[PDB]
Amino acid sequence: GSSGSSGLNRDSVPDNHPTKFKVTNVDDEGVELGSGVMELTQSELVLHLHRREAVRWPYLCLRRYGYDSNLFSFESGRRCQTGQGIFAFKCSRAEEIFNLLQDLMQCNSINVMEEPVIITRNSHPAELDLPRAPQPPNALGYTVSS
């Protein structure tokens, strides 16, 4: 929880902004591959970078979201823009990202802004993700006669 606003322009994004974070995508050894800006907002997570395409992940896809010494990372299922995989990023503020993620992910943002038409509308049936299911109960035995 926090607040504050002002009618001031921004000439550039700092390394310490309260909603943007300068990040660098890293490999299995922790070597630096490419730089970007991670944006946290009530809609979803977004990466901004060069003339390349931008990249998005909804909080629904984030089964887990972790932080370590200068390291931020997240897991995501086959349903998202990038497909199935874990993506890790070097960042001087990885704990402040982790502290802000949970503030938005607990909030759920239920239609918080007016969205366009989407395939959640009524239509023909198709392959579409299933909800949770209950654990099946145990059976009982019986006694034996003379």
Binding site: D28, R63, G66, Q102, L130
Partner: peptide, 19 residues
């Protein structure tokens, strides 16, 4: 966007329990 073999973090809060 590098795809890792496993999760690099031991301390984690599980948020969404849906696929």
């Amino acid at each position: 966007l590098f795809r890792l073999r496993h999760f690099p973090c031991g301390n984690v809060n599980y948020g969404y329990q849906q696929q």
